[PDB]
């Protein structure tokens, strides 16, 4: 594939960069959730000494901000935390008018509909929630829920029938439609609990990655594992490039960038700090996303740093 490259070293965080969010609106507007008890913004500046210099600080929770997301624009962000609190932030003045509480335990991830009418969150409370943005009470189904934790729930960014892929610590994948609010399809076969389930904007593909050691993908049209894929370690986050059929995942310290032909490895782009000691554990890449241009990769890491990669070829 295209040869990757770094863009230097910069200071952007003192704790784990838990979540990232790049909107498809601007190339220099990124939101990051960290263990620094805050939510940070990143305006990319394309300077050698500094790339993203913070301008605004977002403090509104009591625990780790578990997941931050943007739908399509750059006006509002949706945030969850470890106290079960849901929030939305306007970037105009750094405040919030409304608070959503529905979880008595941990909240891991939250989903924002492209049309801003559905808020779906994963919780350790063992309860999938189906709520909205304006606080309008809607019919909800509590049956056929997970028997274990509920980690990550995402959204399909297209004008079609809504779909929720709910993953749990039960090693199960559950399929939900907003119209019927029932379990259309159940996928089993994981040897370990599933961490993150993601969907492509095409509205026909889905993937799951956790501690089972497999980043095997599922098709949401009917429901069946289609492509085989094994890993060297556990999987924590997945996505697709929103221009290619690429599957982007982090295998801990390194990443898994496959080719478009047949998803066969060409060269693992290993990253490691040059040191005389091999006794230092490599950082684990919790999450990653593509930029607006699609050639810049922004990823959070266990070493409280942002590794910004781009293409230079040769």
């Amino acid at each position: 594939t295209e040869q990757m490259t770094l863009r230097g070293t910069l200071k952007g965080h003192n704790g784990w960069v838990t979540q990232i969010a790049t909107t498809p609106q601007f190339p220099d507007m990124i939101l990051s959730a960290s263990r620094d008890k805050t939510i940070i913004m990143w305006k990319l500046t394309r300077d050698e000494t500094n790339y993203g210099i913070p301008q605004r600080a977002l403090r509104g929770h009591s625990h780790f901000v578990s997941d931050v997301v943007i739908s399509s624009d750059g006006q509002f962000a949706l945030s969850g935390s470890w106290d079960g609190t849901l929030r939305l932030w306007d970037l105009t003045t750094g405040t919030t008018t409304r608070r959503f509480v529905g979880h008595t335990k941990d909240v891991l991830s939250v989903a924002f509909s492209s049309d801003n009418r559905q808020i779906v969150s994963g919780s350790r409370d063992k309860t999938i929630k189906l709520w909205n943005t304006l606080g309008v009470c809607k019919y909800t189904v509590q049956d056929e829920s997970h028997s274990e934790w509920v980690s990550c729930v995402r959204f399909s960014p297209n004008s079609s029938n809504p779909i929720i892929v709910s993953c749990g610590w039960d090693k199960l994948v559950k399929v939900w439609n907003l119209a019927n609010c029932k379990l259309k399809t159940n996928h089993i076969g994981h040897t370990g609990y599933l961490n993150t389930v993601t969907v492509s904007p095409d509205g026909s593909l889905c993937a799951s990655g956790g501690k089972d050691g497999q980043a095997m993908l599922w098709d949401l049209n009917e429901g069946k594992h289609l492509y085989t894929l094994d890993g060297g370690d556990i999987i924590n986050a997945l996505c697709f490039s929103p221009n290619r059929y690429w599957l982007c995942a982090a295998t801990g310290p390194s990443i898994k960038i496959w080719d478009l032909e047949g998803k066969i490895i060409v060269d693992e782009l290993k990253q490691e700090v040059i040191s005389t000691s091999s006794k230092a554990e490599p950082p684990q890449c919790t999450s990653l996303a593509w930029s607006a241009d699609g050639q810049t990769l922004f990823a959070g890491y266990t070493d409280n740093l942002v590794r910004v990669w781009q293409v230079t070829i040769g």
Binding site: I53, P54, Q55, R56, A57, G94
Partner: protein, 138 residues
């Protein structure tokens, strides 16, 4: 309207109510330099020349302080002023200037915006102080 930042030392606590202005600083009916001790005055002046008068020229902060003792009322006015300035800059203008001033204040004094946790210890019977004991004959 305050930046909602507060500042403490010992049982004392001070908050800087904040508004848009031209850097006029006042402490409970008095500006920052007419405070009585005139030897702790340098302790009150620490921030305004630690980072310069220019940074204290576009924001009006009134520091209200309630607490015990003279010096314990100090280390609250100054810390409240510095942390109020840093919070005002962080929430209003940007972080780069805020980060610069935070680094400057921490380098000069790491306990410039963090509170001093120490408090007076309780007293246990059979002694006048926390650790002192009554004298007895052998």
């Amino acid at each position: 309207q305050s930046v909602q930042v507060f500042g403490r030392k010992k049982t004392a606590t001070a908050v800087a109510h904040c508004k848009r202005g031209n850097g006029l600083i006042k402490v409970n009916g008095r500006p920052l330099e007419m405070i009585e001790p005139r030897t702790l005055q340098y302790k009150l002046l620490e921030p305004v020349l630690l980072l310069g008068k220019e940074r204290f020229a576009g924001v009006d902060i009134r520091v209200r302080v309630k607490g015990g003792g003279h010096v314990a009322q100090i280390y609250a006015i100054r810390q409240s002023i510095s942390k109020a300035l840093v919070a005002y800059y962080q929430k209003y203008v940007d972080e780069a200037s805020k980060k610069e001033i935070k680094d400057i204040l921490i380098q000069y004094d790491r306990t410039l915006l963090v509170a001093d946790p120490r408090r007076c210890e309780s007293k246990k019977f059979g002694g006048p102080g926390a650790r002192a004991r009554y004298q007895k004959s052998y």
